[PDB]
Ligand binder design. Structure first.
Ligand SMILES: *[C@]([C])(=O)O[C][C][N+]([C])([C])[C]
Ligand SMILES: *[C@]([C])(=O)O[C][C][N+]([C])([C])[C]
Lengths: 527, 527
């Protein structure tokens, strides 16, 4: 049967889902690891002991324990990102959408969800891979990984909580995809892993980590790169926060064993409740438990790896949205509110920059302010708001990504860069927030095709183009069958991705990125 | 006789000069100090022992010994600034142009010439005060002062070469004007001292130095302020350069006395020949012998004086030209030539910034470059040239002046600010040089009125407006009888001064000046 599939783990029974006046198969909730519960919490993922009998993959799996957002209870704009299933430590499962008739060998697209590494669900509605599968004839897999303490608590040195385990959960699902995707119609020699934010960052880490490079062919990174400042921590830092979390739970802190054991008796939500109390700064766009540069998953500093070509050479397609920071200002900067134009006074501006660049000394915060301030109109609220928006985004997404793209390209085999700048017509977030972080996702997965969603004709157009660019890149290493230029260090071309006739530009935010990538760090090192 | 005048020093016999189809009196070469020759070299000025008999002031006096510019022999554009009279250590003389009929009590305008303190002549043709005298009915005095080692060599502590003696020569002429200008038709209670560059800097120093404040009423500062980085040196620095000059002349350097004595046997040109060998840096816009912050002429650091209101409160009219730096790049930066468009490569750009900000460490030169570079078009030669032009000017003239104007205004009684941006139609300097340093002078003195000079009708217009603004400011403390706004720290208004209908703007180069006046020094202090 088109829904019964055999895999090296056991048989799996999917279900067929209807899609745009048609249908496809969906094998949802196939497990790829032993449930990381009990004494296995914090431990590296374990392969799923095979099973016998048909595994019933007719419905979405639980979501990993995580911080649920209640900032705007009921507001769809934010709840659309909250776990829509029971959360459980038993969440390591993958979902596959397969065109019907089942292909014999098509390109595979594996989606790694975002969420600052503290959250994420492969079950969100915007991550519904059927329109892409259907529309582009690709096998869409979306995996899940442990987030939060559960996936990133790092007591480097113990094997009980080595850290990066949430990155190994992804590898592991990449492995299950390598080994079994052939029985679903997918070609394991043509899987493109793609992700947004912590997911696009994950993608780039699999591109760097030796033990993952072989499990996929191409990569698409959306609004994130392995080198984003919020993407990783030193082992010492990860240890500090690990201990600190212990303190907030009154754990014996005399040893990693007593520590890990205490943290394992704790119910999930107890860890979640104090999760944010461990950051070392009053900051915006920093999450507590993130990958640690351990010397195992990552051999040395991501930067020396970037510098020495020590990474998987292949083709990559990446980009950023216009207003990446708005979302984080709205949530943790004073002066911003969901319901006002959030015009910002210098007093609140000056506070926003301090939160955005937590590690800067005063001369540093002075350099940022000098660069992002219109001294000829310094008390404009609109300008202070937008200026703060560019600081949060340039510093945390746009510039670290530009650094990666320029370093990778030196050794890669084809880089394609976009700048997404389209505000969905039906966005329920305030206009001041612009083209928000995470809002390209819905175009990439084809929601603009389902009319009951109220997108506009041209937006439908744009979706289809984006799904084609993405699918067509997955299959061939090139987005084009109107050419989206190849990005080269010399010319630096990239393209806009909005409902207008595309246009090519060069040097995405150079002025600013020279500041953040070259000047600032030099400044902060001198002082 | 209209040409015979009595003064407390002796009688003086002028001559009448023809002016625009009319005439006026001119008393040229009246001495105000004992000739600073022989053992008096480097010494403070001595009052002119009175004389008996008519002193014959019918012709211009010698010019002070100084470095003559031979960079472009015969090129008028540069020779127009060279001494046009025999140079001599006997040069302390003043010149007075008086309307005919001799007024009983008109406003007095005393011109202090510029020249980096290393040069200057009160006899240049552009400093010809008859059109202003005639046209505006003001008594125009133009004084002279010792420049170079002769006027600024400072061996602080000896009374034989105290330094600042060239500033005392000016004071002294201000004194002779105070005491005698009444016998020429001038009102000694309404003298406006005005100067350009080292002269506008001098003006502001008389505004600060306690012993000069009383000798004048109002001040006009053109392209210079007391706080310009090239305008003064510490006593230690002045001593260093004093000694160093001695080294270049093989003077016994065992003591100030042996040193001063050696320097006094030296013929004038021997001091001039090695004058430039003493700067402590490879730099552009730095001169060797300049006023020293001695604790006598200047009580404390010009900056604490600026900060504490310790200065003459009155009305001041000041401003800068659009392209102040071009002239110094042309002469000491590689890549610039008088006969080419001087497009500049980054390699030469990067060398120009090093020369422009000699005291900056690397992080400093990195901050300047980041600010003055168009990263989206970094290999443009036009942009690198102009960018270097703005660096030289912003750093050396425009921003220190903006600092003074903002500090003074806090305690002053009326500040008027202009931005001169008109390139004379008949300028013989390359277009790339723009509105050059020193090129407002000719409009201020009314040369555009003499038709045999080929200026355009609208330029004639502009001259007359400028002479009126200047004269009308001198007489009343206000440029207006189309209003030139008063500059306030709050609004910061200023006006353009060109042949188009004037316009008011605010915040002259704020972006940049916050960089130079606030950020840079903070940066260079941290590192
Ligand atoms: C990145 C940092 O993982 O952020 C994702 C943001 N979100 C779409 C609002 C959840
Ligand atoms: C200032 C520094 O005194 O410069 C005057 C420049 N000049 C008009 C070219 C002689």
């Amino acid at each position: 049967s088109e829904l019964l599939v055999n895999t090296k783990s056991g048989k799996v029974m999917g279900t067929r889902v209807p899609v745009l006046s048609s249908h496809i198969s969906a094998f949802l909730g196939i497990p790829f690891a032993e449930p990381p519960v009990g004494n296995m919490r914090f431990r590296r993922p374990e392969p799923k002991k095979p099973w016998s009998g048909v595994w019933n993959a007719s419905t979405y799996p639980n979501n990993c324990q995580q911080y649920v957002d209640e900032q705007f209870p009921g507001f769809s704009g934010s709840e659309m990102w909250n776990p829509n299933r029971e959360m459980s430590e038993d969440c390591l499962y993958l979902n596959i959408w397969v065109p019907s008739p089942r292909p014999k060998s098509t390109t595979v697209m594996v989606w790694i969800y975002g969420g600052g590494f503290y959250s994420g669900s492969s079950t969100l509605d915007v991550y519904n891979g059927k329109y892409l599968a259907y529309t582009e004839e690709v096998v869409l897999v979306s995996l899940s990984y442990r987030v939060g303490a559960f996936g990133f608590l790092a007591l480097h040195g113990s094997q009980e909580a080595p850290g990066n385990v949430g990155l190994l959960d992804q590898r592991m699902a990449l492995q299950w995809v390598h080994d079994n995707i052939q029985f679903f119609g997918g070609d394991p020699k043509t899987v493109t892993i793609f992700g947004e934010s912590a997911g696009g960052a994950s993608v780039g880490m699999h591109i760097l980590s030796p033990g993952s490079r072989d499990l996929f062919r191409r990569a698409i990174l959306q609004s994130g790169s392995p080198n984003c400042p919020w993407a990783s921590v030193s082992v010492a830092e990860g240890r500090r926060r690990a201990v600190e979390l212990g303190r907030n739970l009154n754990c014996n802190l005399n040893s990693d064993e007593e520590l890990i054991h205490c943290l394992r008796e704790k119910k999930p939500q107890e860890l979640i409740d104090v999760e944010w109390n461990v950051l070392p700064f009053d900051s915006i766009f920093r999450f507590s438990f993130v990958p640690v540069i351990d010397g195992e998953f990552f051999p040395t500093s991501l930067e020396s790896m970037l510098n020495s070509g020590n990474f998987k050479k292949t083709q990559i397609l990446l980009g950023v949205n216009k207003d990446e920071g708005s979302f984080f200002l709205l949530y943790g900067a004073p002066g911003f509110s969901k319901d006002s134009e959030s015009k910002i006074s210098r007093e609140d501006f000056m506070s926003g920059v301090k939160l955005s660049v937590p590690h800067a000394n005063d001369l540093g915060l002075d350099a940022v302010t000098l660069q992002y301030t219109d001294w000829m109109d310094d008390n404009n609220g609109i300008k202070n708001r937008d200026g703060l928006d560019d600081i949060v985004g340039d510093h945390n997404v746009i510039c670290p990504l530009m650094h990666f793209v320029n370093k990778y390209t030196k050794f890669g085999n084809g880089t394609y860069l976009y700048f997404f700048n389209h505000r969905a017509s039906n966005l329920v977030w305030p206009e001041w927030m612009g083209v928000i972080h995470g809002y390209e996702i819905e175009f990439v997965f084809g929601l603009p095709l389902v009319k009951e969603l109220n997108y506009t004709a041209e937006e439908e157009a744009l979706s289809r183009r984006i799904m084609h660019y993405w699918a067509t890149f997955a299959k061939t290493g090139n987005p084009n069958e109107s050419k989206w230029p190849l990005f080269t260090t010399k010319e630096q071309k990239f393209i806009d991705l909005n409902t207008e006739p595309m246009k090519v530009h060069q040097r995405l935010r150079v002025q600013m990125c020279v500041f953040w990538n070259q000047f600032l760090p030099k400044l902060l090192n001198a002082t």
